[PDB]
Amino acid sequence: PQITLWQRPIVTIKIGGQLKEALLNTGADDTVLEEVNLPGRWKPKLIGGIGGFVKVRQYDQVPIEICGHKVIGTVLVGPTPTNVIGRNLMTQIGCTLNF
Amino acid sequence: PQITLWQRPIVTIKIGGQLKEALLNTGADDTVLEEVNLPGRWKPKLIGGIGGFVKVRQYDQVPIEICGHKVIGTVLVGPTPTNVIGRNLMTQIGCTLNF
């Protein structure tokens, strides 16, 4: 697990053979990560939309460990102010909001 | 309630006499709402920072009902793509992430 929200919900993740930190972001649809090198196929995706769009590489069905939980989901790879775990992956780990 | 994340976590809020919809956003520090006309004193606050800053009006200790929970917190009033309930108010309603 239960994470309170007095601080930013930053967790450790393992992806593409690297240990990283990422923000559990219920306001984000998708997961976006920077400085990762993933194997396999990708397609460009445009995200954002305020001020213009940002193009990223969309990798589908990426194995990723989020806070001890080995899951699979789409990871967008490109420049991001900070690494974001979006709802697409929070569903996979069985993460809910509770009050 | 327990809110799963397959959809955007949009909830009903009562604020300044009005009923509104807003997103439970754990990636947001602060709560930003548009088209509300709150009573009492305020100070300008600069938020965002990517591409420039956005100036909003910061109201402190605002009575607000979020999904049936009557709480008190800081509300920033200004133009926002989506009304956002940030961590500042999610702490007040006792909202946690769980997996």
């Binding site: 972001n25 306001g27 984000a28 998708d30 995200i47 939309g49 | 956003n25 990636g27 947001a28 520090d29």
Partner: peptide, 7 residues
């Protein structure tokens, strides 16, 4: 700061 994302 504040962190959503559409799409």
């Amino acid at each position: 700061t504040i962190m959503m994302q559409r799409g």
